[model samples]
Target: SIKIDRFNNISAVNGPGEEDTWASAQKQGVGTANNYVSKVWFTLANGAISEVYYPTIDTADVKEIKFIVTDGKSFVPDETKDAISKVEKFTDKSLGYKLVNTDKKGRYRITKDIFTDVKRNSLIMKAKFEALEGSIHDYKLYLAYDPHIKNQGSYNEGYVIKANNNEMLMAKRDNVYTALSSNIGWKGYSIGYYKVNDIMTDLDENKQMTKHYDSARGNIIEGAEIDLTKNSEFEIVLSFGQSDSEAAKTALETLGEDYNNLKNNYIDEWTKYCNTLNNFNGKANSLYYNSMMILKASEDKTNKGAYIASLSIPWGDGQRDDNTGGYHLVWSRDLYHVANAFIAAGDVDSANRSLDYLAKVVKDNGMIPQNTWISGKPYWTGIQLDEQADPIILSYRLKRYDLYDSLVKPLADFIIKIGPKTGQERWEEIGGYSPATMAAEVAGLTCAAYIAEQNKDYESAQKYQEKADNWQKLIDNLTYTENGPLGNGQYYIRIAGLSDPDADFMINIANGGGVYDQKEIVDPSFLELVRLGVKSADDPKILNTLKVVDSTIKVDTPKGPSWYRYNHDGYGEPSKTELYHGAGKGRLWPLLTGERGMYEIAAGKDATPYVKAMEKFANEGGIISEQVWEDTGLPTDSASPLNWAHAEYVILFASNIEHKVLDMPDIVYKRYVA
Candidate 1:
């Protein structure tokens, strides 16, 4: 399946496909820290307080920020080029330099996703500023806003930068270049960014926004200046609104005295959550918890029963050239795996949402898109069929019988209707029958048939089983070469076409070549076989694919050995426009690694290496990645904390969890029959 190759290239992508869950995702602008605003959160790992972001509803990335305490005249720890500081920043989520600008040591975070605060058009993060061996109260605190997007666009123009007394500040901007009335959230933010002390009176520096410049979607930037009253400690709350309104100002008043309450609540929330996962005794316990925690970050707090496969990226990339390059949407196939993970980890609530989300997004004719916005809005069409089928398996596997009941027939019906023209491949690659797509359809149909048969729905059972068997044969025939290029290179082919060679993608960017019809793409989707409980670990086909993936597609990153979307990878540095890359791109992906681990465990092989690798991928904050760079094995790559990565891990480890439903409940099993 792969040409034995290089060892340092970074290979990365989502876990197979999209999940039909939440519309909100862990896009780049979203904070890596646990969320309430989800835009802010930073651990004092080693010694640094690094965290702050506000990507208003408009899609303008707030970029990076630096917190400073000025000694009445100058600031001590300046992160800019002008000042030399001892603070070091690493790829792990933590910000640099231990800011001991206070008396007590405390950890801070939003107890959950940013649903509550975001609903109120506000964001609140616990204050984590301490003394740099000096009295914090003796100095003024300034949260400096830098219009810096990593390896990307420069800041937008016409920024409204000003402070709301010593209490707060607002640095806001809009889409100035668009001649249209609403270039991008002229008033609203990533949905809205109203950091208010109102529209503060008298603080009019740059407030006179010439608002000029006919080009480049601009960003308005500013900072919050504060005078710490307590020499020992203090707290600050920043609120946002669709406009610079009173509510934004009062958000501080609302959360004012309760900031400590919020912090304590966060601590308690995390503490209690630690014990919530399904118990799994394993050689790698941390892997189990880390995977769960990473998956938790992807949940969309704004919606209760929905989880984002990851951050919805690009700030305002609702446009085309859209796919994996930006996460701003959810993929069905990805969410299905995430749901299974939730069930295994004892997070039935999150898992339930995936099923619930499936029901909500189902099309009139039973078809669904590859992914959609958090609002259940469209970003892409039904480009892939796996997105249509996987939910059936997810619902049944998790014993979400009602979801299975709602989805099974519709999805099966769609598959049969679509025939072999099952939209896109797992990697969101160009269409044409692929292993994961057809294999998944086979499994989804087969599972539905089993459910229907058990329910005594003989007609549906016969129909779906026939469909399942049909796809099974389809994949078998496609994988078998008939005078192909690689000398009867007969293996499970990822794609099937000689004229149109397999195109490995970066996001949705196509890098056509390197992939032939005979050789299968080493993808996590291959796990569908094992997942359906059909293929054993040692099946020659399974082992051969794994061997090929390990030997040819593997890249030795600092974290350890990792692999990607077969030999052809297209993940190189991207641009504001380019959508897909090719075989020569990518980094080590967690989703791929998790699948490898699961497949190994099924084979009764030592998954310790894979488990250790999974552990290494989960940062201290529990943020997993779509792909960890071969350079550092850190999630510095934009694809950090991919939901599929965590989901696959949860399944890999959770399967070890001694738990099962055994059968559909009596009422459920008999419902359809009756």
Candidate 2:
């Protein structure tokens, strides 16, 4: 039995035999690579598309994979691009062929070239070999239309190809423009032909295509390949239209002069980018690669805010689903952390673009939408309504709700005036929050207003700051609980509580409240807000509230001790085991609320435990998971390794390190210190 720790380190490794190296033991059990490697694939069939993802490998060999096309239809063999033909034999010498698998029903082994076996009537062809290997190998596959095949009416009709052993491969073909664009594109199309001379000798010439391709070209395969040996395994992909000589051929010819050289260059790009951040102290190289994979899985400006979580690799079907779908849409909360990470890594463009996406998605009511779809529509009114109505679920839907009401307007105002050099008008019209749920809205608003002030918009900045102050007053007066001076005085904030007798109620109407009403949750921020309010008011209560907030700090055993939800159980509910919510959970919690700076204040002379706790969480990938067991103190939820958690970790770590190193306050502290 092998016990994987929070940081994904294997402990108590007891495999078949005594292992001399940790690497050897890791191989004996399910390796981290198998568990962490991105397994999602994108596929197009008929006119519809879908995604195929295997979170856990049930079998070493995947028998079949499928996805719906964008046309909301399953791909049928008789469809537009669904033509298949059999290769009875092969004649090409440079391109070695094998009949590894047969399309039993289709009666054809999909071969690379139509010349392999042109006479066969079979609609599908199993590749001649299991995997293609070579320092430089090229093969052309045919897409033949069978009149007898039935049309599925989907424009995305195409065939699915399986890769052996889940090995990564670079598939290139001329006619597969749409598929290439779906993955990597050039000028309006995903496919591009680059000349070797254009890349090496004349960088500007290669860039000249940008004028035509700029926003129109799909995914651009503009890099090199490395680390592949002559016999290293890989897969070749070719997509063709129904016609015998589709326009895809012309695109393939674009790789003039040094096509193979360009291909190697492309592979080298992957290697170079993958190797950029090699200093990670994770448990395995797989973890490092997985981190790189996540970075690669993020969205770029080319997709126009359409960021997918992972590439559809082994699952050749081009279907993207919500569960395994390319995270094509922009989520404000998600991007916040992503942008910060980009900034930390000095990826200025990515960081700026991420922030730009947030500005672009501001709603009319001064609300930053939780998530926006590919079509540029906002989803989910940000108010937490019910368990069934969890904001995470409505994240895919478009609505006028403002999840970050406090943050949106000010942020938008700031960006419009002082953000990157693009998309000013889009940010100005963005609205703020409306629910009036809690002080977070006000705090977010204030923060945004502060940002706006930095952007030199005094008028708008003052207006939002005033509004945030009003909300803060409400929170201070209505939300805070008064006991005594230091020990007795505490603040209890509300949660999105239950309303109706039934669990399906959208809003919590208890205590004469409406939807988005709050229930006292002993929120950690209640005291923080009171302190802020008191500082504004210069009231004695501020010091008392600060002391009360400080008292909630405690030491958890495994992670070493930090702030927990005061007056709350180890977990909020019976099902939950640890205090994982609030501003203390991730980066936003500490950075936004100033808890990271407050550690010494709360912990007193010995703040080592708190720092250790933070380091443990940070090093462990920073994802919020199921409650940690009281007895064992381990995360139990499957969603523990969430992307948001990692994003938050990156931001928090960067911010904290920068602040400490520079010994300053705010963004300046981060910039100057680093």
Candidate 3:
């Protein structure tokens, strides 16, 4: 036996060896087509398929599936690196998308109609190859699949197998299996260690699959060459299962099905889901429908209505499981936004499903985890009070009186147990009194009072109402500051670091990393006070805070005015091409803009501009990013198709149409609005 660092190779160079990195953060498209049985999530980026999740939404199974081309001679180019790719949805009502990749030298082109088969847990890439200049026979096409099975690339077993009367590529780790199959047989196949004996090295040097190795382990790469002369119109099926045989069978069966049937079924399922939603008579109907689809697709199949925050990782190019788990996990607060968005869209069934899922995952003490995997397993250890309080508001709005004893009572008690003090605020950085957290807390208890009263529990209802009132009255006294540094010498800061608002308190910034006065930081989250109905929309203190927010954290873009999380925030990329490793500038968030729009609606102002701004903030394919660059107005290297941002846009769009926040609990409005 020889001592070897088996996982030490080129493909795993960026981060730790066992901890593989995810693909780009700004995905052009993502979805599961509302298919529950297959439970496969597909993400498109750089004109190719990236980071496909299988079995569970939190676990990513494949790094990417990209193409390599050559003339079987001196010229070889990787499709993701050498070609220009453009992605568009198959249509406005469908979740299916198409990607067009043209070679830079005008030598060839590949058009892919990408979708998942509704009947199986498989992804189909129906590709067509065309020669732009010469005969198609002169070019050779190679498919390279990087499998990070079960979210790890370091220790997977790879094999070249003959199954279902055809050659197939397979990888397995733990109990999860991934099998890649093609309609036409592979002319040549190779499986080798990444960055060592991998297919890229072979193709780049010999211009084809020279070393036809059958099997390899430790950061495996699967490569195969298809004879274009045999079949120019071909299909690649990526399938997953709990066992190797199950995966292989799925791949071949899905490959045998008609591509058109799969595409049509996927499109129809999503289209019908949209039809069931409230029709948007506004200008951005497609965007509204797409946002609803994105939110629905991000949910885990096994967990029912448990929706993850996004299908992406923030600055994912450099992120590994060791550094960060990415946004694939469920956050309670984000789920609240998503559930409400569904409620606003006239899908009470989906909204109720979300509440049911929440009732199960909530902690015994009624505290929700900061984030959780699809299995209800907690990931991050930090506890934010807003997360604890949000589900109560959701349950209250949906009037889930059945959850009163199990969900509402415990949460309201916990908020009272830890009144006005969050272990971590909505920002999840420093612990203090946060206006946003307080707003949710006040609203949650207020809603709880109504639910308790409905259940005929008069004593508990009275207690909830009293506590909510006391907390609401003290919000201004605890959060609003008079000795602040910003405009007019009187405004609200990002958070109150001490119980006394006037006291001097020092805190360290998380991502940017610096110590500063609490009074100097300003964010737009105080608008939650108005949005949640804790305070009047036109309250003078609220009016003053808006001035400070606009003057301090707002970044005016072509889309409109986007705002940062807080002043001096730093949780983004160093530049457009870079990934966030440790320290980088925080970019503008479109979700904040949507939040501002909701506040405007509460203030009796038209929010059409803000609504249109969020639409422009999305990429060409209609996916909204978590943040955007100040200069480019393009999505920053943060997560895209952010469910929270999309949910906010949906809520704002509906609010603008109806002239009220759709999910605002009636009890909170009755108490505060008058």
Q: Among these predicted structures, which one has the highest lDDT?
A: 3
TM-score for each candidate, following the candidate numbering: 0.69, 0.43, 0.95
Ranking the candidates on lDDT from highest down gives: 3, 1, 2
Please say which candidate is ahead in lDDT: 2 or 3: 3
Q: Once superposed on the true structure, which residue ranges of model 2 sit more than 4 Å away at CA?
A: 1-296, 300-302, 305-329, 363-367, 383-458, 483-489, 495-520, 524-637, 659-674
For model 2 the TM-score comes to: 0.43
Candidate 2 lDDT by residue in tens digits, 1-674: 11111111111111111111000000000111111222222221211111211221110111111110111122122212342322111211111112222233332223222111111111111223222222122211111111101111111112212122111112222222111111121111111222222111122333212221111111112222211223223222222232322213322332122434433333344445445543333322333233333444445323344443222211222221112222334455445445444545444455554444444544433435445553446654432111111121122111222433333443434333321111111111111211223332344444445555555667766876566556544444554445323366443432222221112223232222224323222335343332222223124444444456456543344554434433333322233433222112211122212233332332223333333443444323222331233333444322223344444344434344433311111322112112
Candidate 2's C-alpha lDDT?
0.29
| Whole-model lDDT values for every prediction | 0.47, 0.29, 0.83
All-Cα superposition RMSD per candidate = 12.8, 19.7, 4.3
Superposed Cα deviation of residue 413, candidate 2 (Å):
8.9
Off by over 4 Å in 1: 1-64, 68-141, 145-167, 170-218, 224-233, 242-246, 281-287, 312-325, 363-365, 403-405, 454-456, 482-488, 498-527, 574-584, 656-674
Q: By the TM-score metric, which is better: model 2 or model 3? A: 3
How do the residues 360-444 of candidate 3 rate in per-residue lDDT, one tens digit apiece?
A: 8864435687777777777888868788788899987887888988998888887788777887888788888889988998899
